[PDB]
Design a binder for this molecule. Sequence first.
Ligand SMILES: C[C@@H]1O[C@@H](O[C@H]2[C@H](O)[C@@H](CO)NC[C@@H]2O)[C@H](O)[C@H](O[C@@H]2O[C@H](CO)[C@@H](O)[C@H](O[C@@H]3O[C@H](CO)[C@@H](O)[C@H](O)[C@@H]3O[C@H]3O[C@H](CO)[C@@H](O)[C@H](O)[C@@H]3O)[C@@H]2O)[C@H]1O
Ligand code: CL
Ligand code: CL
Ligand code: CL
Length: 412
Amino acid sequence: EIQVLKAPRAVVWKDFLGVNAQFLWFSPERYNKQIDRLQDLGLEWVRLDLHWDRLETAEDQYQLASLDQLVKDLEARQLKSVFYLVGSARFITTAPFYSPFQDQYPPRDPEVFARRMAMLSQRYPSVAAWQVWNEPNLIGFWRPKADPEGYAKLLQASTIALRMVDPEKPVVSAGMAFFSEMPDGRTMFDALGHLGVESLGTIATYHPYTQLPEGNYPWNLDFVSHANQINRALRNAGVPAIWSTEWGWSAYKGPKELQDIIGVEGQADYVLRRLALMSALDYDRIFLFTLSDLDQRASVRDRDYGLLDLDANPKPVYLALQRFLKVTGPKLRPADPPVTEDLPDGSFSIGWTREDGRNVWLFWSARGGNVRLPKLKEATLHDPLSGKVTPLSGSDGLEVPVKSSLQMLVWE
Ligand SMILES: C[C@@H]1O[C@@H](O[C@H]2[C@H](O)[C@@H](CO)NC[C@@H]2O)[C@H](O)[C@H](O[C@@H]2O[C@H](CO)[C@@H](O)[C@H](O[C@@H]3O[C@H](CO)[C@@H](O)[C@H](O)[C@@H]3O[C@H]3O[C@H](CO)[C@@H](O)[C@H](O)[C@@H]3O)[C@@H]2O)[C@H]1O
Ligand SMILES: [Cl-]
Ligand SMILES: [Cl-]
Ligand SMILES: [Cl-]
């Protein structure tokens, strides 16, 4: 069962591939070093989390100094930022008095939240887009149960308030967990659609984390199918844009909590394979989770999603992504794979052209094996995980080794 992808449009990495970032967890010295490493990749989009109960610690009493300095720094470094605000301040929460998760409940009055997003947008005009809440389909962000009507009211109040500040600035709806599935068996995209939320014209976004790059189980690699189905439905509903605001894997050692243990090399492999899929699907922009490893304030799994370690130095996934983007160059146009014979069962196959006009073939298969390219006499094979570069030549076609990990064939 071979999966061939051809992107719907050209991809310019600087415009398309952003990273999540937790810069408020770090000193400016440290986060500026993270930004150096991001710029070295040729990227500029960042997505940052804001927690209302950290920003407003009592009614009308705020802690803005670190955020003020961060926004100044992001503007000085010429990054493009989307910030999301999530959680309830203590004075406004619907949490019962005894809950240990006071901010994981929605606000008693959505207009109060809306006024804070307007205050942030007015304070920080350099921010490129504002996002309303996070994963409202997940209990840990919206207790005690998912509530499409409640989220729709929150998104409407926020959209109106943000547009009063700046009618041109994008309003991004919350990144939905997974493909927006809810515990009750509905999906938040379907439920919001039945409420007519598309009339608000917010950017739609979801967080399609799966165990493997191409699906959750080896016998059901349905990531492409599932993403295509959700993205077609969002386009049919008239969304202005589709982003994926989080995806990725943790290099953590364990103990296992949801994600299987794959380590730094598994992180590098899986991120590159998933990037090869998502950059050929119908997203306008995607954001890898996440730029940096985090300290003990994060959950054990959440500490190790970084491109960078705690010193802001490259992990294997950063070096692999760097090699991949150097091979592609800055802009890819959709193309077709080379003609193949005996491409292995289960292969993934994506063709592009680079700015120099040469073709790039991204391919892999769990079975490994070999493939014949009968019409080529010359090409170069790059393994972004190891850095190996292999010139291939044949009088009557090429034989190319296929790996479980992504390789890139560059050919004329
Ligand atoms: C960077 C990370 O991003 C988001 O989480 C990602 C997650 O990392 C990935 C991978 O697992 N999955 C998708 C998801 O989007 C969140 O922004 C994370 O922040 C959280 O935001 C919640 C809503 O504001 C907070 O409730 C949450 O707070 C933690 O709660 C756990 C218990 O569930 C505590 O163990 C932990 O200490 C945190 O609680 C402190 O902070 C709360 C928020 O200020 C306070 O209300 C609480 O009293 C504690 O001081 C977390 O902040 C984000 O980290
Ligand atoms: Cl942050
Ligand atoms: Cl915050
Ligand atoms: Cl060919």
